[PDB]
């Protein structure tokens, strides 16, 4: 019933620097050590370093020597992680741990990208006669090149939810995201209705309704 509260998500351009924070409540940080750990997308935990707030002494893993700098301020009972010369390799969720690992922060997501806000481009993934079996056809929408996350995808103004699979976004080398949203439906319905995906990207206020009609090949 003690906690560590980390700062909000960051969107930073490469070559720049960021300072994340972790504020403790329920104890005085000078009494224990404060650690920072990294977790790249879909990967494991990697230790960065730790600090003794009582005297400011730090220890780092050699792999982060010229990348991370850790500090603490007992007056605010907060610890900081400053990451320099950001590259794509730095995109990850950063955790703060203290009280021997008993307590962990919720984590702070850092996304390194040089891209400016951009709405997505929406292309159809047309149901094909060749890609039809047992009375069902698969169709979808490719929402490509948008920044930043998140994007909302609906089908037939939300009246279609069953069988829908909207995949998690992939950050491309361009510093832009892309994802696919597919759905399997009765192939017969393709003769009485047109399927449309409703894509909405709030940061750029881009709303697109894309019709996905059959195109066999």
């Amino acid at each position: 019933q003690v906690q560590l509260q980390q700062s909000g998500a960051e969107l930073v351009k490469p070559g720049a620097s960021v300072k994340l924070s972790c504020t403790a409540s329920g104890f005085n940080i000078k009494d224990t050590y404060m650690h920072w750990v990294k977790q790249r997308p879909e990967q494991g935990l990697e230790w960065i370093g730790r600090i003794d707030p009582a005297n400011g002494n730090t220890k780092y893993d050699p792999k982060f020597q010229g990348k991370a700098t850790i500090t603490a301020d007992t007056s605010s009972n907060t610890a900081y992680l400053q990451l320099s010369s950001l590259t794509s390799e730095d995109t990850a969720v950063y955790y703060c741990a203290s009280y021997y690992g008993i307590y962990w922060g919720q984590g702070t997501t850092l996304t390194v990208s040089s891209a400016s806000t951009k709405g997505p481009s929406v292309f159809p993934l047309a149901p094909s006669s060749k890609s039809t079996s047992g009375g069902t056809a698969a169709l979808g929408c490719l929402v490509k090149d948008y920044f930043p996350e998140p994007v909302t995808v609906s089908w037939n103004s939300g009246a279609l939810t069953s069988g829908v699979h909207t995949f998690p976004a992939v950050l491309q080398s361009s510093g832009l995201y892309s994802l696919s949203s597919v759905v399997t439906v009765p192939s017969s319905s393709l003769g009485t209705q047109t399927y449309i995906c409703n894509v909405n990207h709030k940061p750029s206020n881009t709303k697109v309704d894309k019709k996905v009609e059959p195109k066999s090949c």
Binding site: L45, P62, A138, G140, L142, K144, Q172, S180
Partner: protein
């Protein structure tokens, strides 16, 4: 540095069953080990320290044991919230090192994927790029291989994968693979194929289309 070899990396089980995962330290760490759990939402909690001591609040179904340099975590009577990721952590020396992790997911019967291949839309082609997507719908287990072959030549580095979280209703996974080429390199070839290998298929299934016929 002390290397922590955690195995298995994946574990499939059902409600009420017991499961165990182990970590092996490359050097003598004499029980200076902890077990952490990370839920699907990202939050992390320590369940055990000193190899076998449970922290306050942690359920009785969790236990840890030592056998030489092999440290194990056992979850008896699995419950719904236990479907998570686990990591061992050694605090014997700096730098601190973690195990590779172990995913505890829901056991289910085998389910072969429904494979579909989608050619790039003409609206995208005219803008300069071409994205060919291969869809693997509702399959189990998670293990699946997708190979892109353009004119039989195996592709590498020009595709990206994305996989859904185990489905709440049928416990299956779905995966999408996207091959990305420039309009120019796309037009240099004819047959685009997606070869899928999965336990539920007797032999790998290949789905293809011939550019130019579109």
């Amino acid at each position: 540095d002390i290397q922590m070899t955690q195995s298995p990396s994946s574990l499939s089980a059902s409600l009420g069953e017991r499961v165990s995962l182990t970590c092996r330290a490359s050097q003598e760490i004499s029980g200076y080990l902890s077990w952490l759990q990370q839920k699907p939402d990202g939050t992390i909690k320590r369940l055990i320290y000193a190899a076998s001591t449970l922290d306050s609040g942690v359920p009785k179904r969790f236990s840890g044991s030592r056998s030489g340099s092999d440290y194990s975590l056992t979850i008896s009577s699995l419950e719904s919230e236990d479907f998570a990721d686990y990591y061992c952590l050694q605090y014997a020396s700096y730098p601190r090192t973690f195990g590779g992790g172990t995913k505890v997911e829901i056991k289910r019967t085998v389910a072969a994927p429904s494979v579909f291949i989608f050619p790039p839309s003409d609206e995208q082609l005219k803008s300069g790029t071409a994205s060919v997507v291969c869809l693997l719908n509702n399959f189990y287990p998670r293990e699946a291989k997708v190979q892109w072959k353009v004119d039989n030549a195996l592709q590498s580095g020009n595709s990206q994968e994305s996989v859904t979280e185990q489905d709440s209703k049928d416990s299956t996974y779905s995966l999408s693979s996207t091959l990305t080429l420039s309009k120019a390199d796309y037009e240099k070839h004819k047959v685009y194929a997606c070869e899928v290998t999965h336990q539920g298929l007797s032999s790998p299934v290949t789905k293809s289309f011939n550019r130019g016929e579109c």
